[PDB]
Amino acid sequence: QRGGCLQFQNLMYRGEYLAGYAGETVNLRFDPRDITTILVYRQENNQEVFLTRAHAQGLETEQLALDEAEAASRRLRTAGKTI
DNA sequence: CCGACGACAGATAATTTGTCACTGTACAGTAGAATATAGATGCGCATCTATATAGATGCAAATTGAGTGGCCTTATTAAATGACTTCTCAACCAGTCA
């Protein structure tokens, strides 16, 4: 998205050098223990090329695990269904 | 004895439904409006028509005044009245008488 943003687990990620690829599709890889930095790849002829690191925005400093981001999302969905 | 088909039971992905996360896209002053036409209706102005004449003229009775034409006893006498005409109208000398 414009400015080099990606959306993963309802968080917004800003790529370090990603803004030249706005409107392009990319693929991405993450360690479930810490999703605060995500690794973005261009898909190509039978091969993925590493493009940038990307960082989570608007979250707390403490490192965010994948299950914790699901937890925040399902708690928020439960409030929406309640209200 | 060997092979094929049906009953009953058991396990399984396709189908449908639900939930969840990421996303393309509209919100951005804006199509009711412009421009022909036919077709019917109404007001105005002209262009006839048909009726209505009173004045003038011709004519034909109806007197109306003004003409014209046709038909008629007469002679004597007398009186009366009214007229006309004619004629006439000297002057002194000579012879008686109381």
How far apart CA A1 and CA A49 sit, in angstroms, is 19
CA of A55 to C1' of B48 (A): 107
Residues with CB under 7 A from strand B: A 1, 6-10, 70, 73-74, 77-78, 81
**According to the entry, how was the structure determined?**
cryo-EM
Question: What distances in angstroms separate CA A82 from CA A2, A44, A70, A76, one per listed residue?
Answer: 34, 44, 18, 10
Nucleotides in chain B near protein beta carbons (<7 Å)? 19-24
CA of A19 to C1' of B57 (A): 129
Strand arrangement, sheet containing A5-8: A5-8, A11-15, A48-57, A34-43, A27-31
DSSP H or E segment with residue A68 = helix A66-82
Q: Resolution (in Å) of the shown entry?
A: 3.0
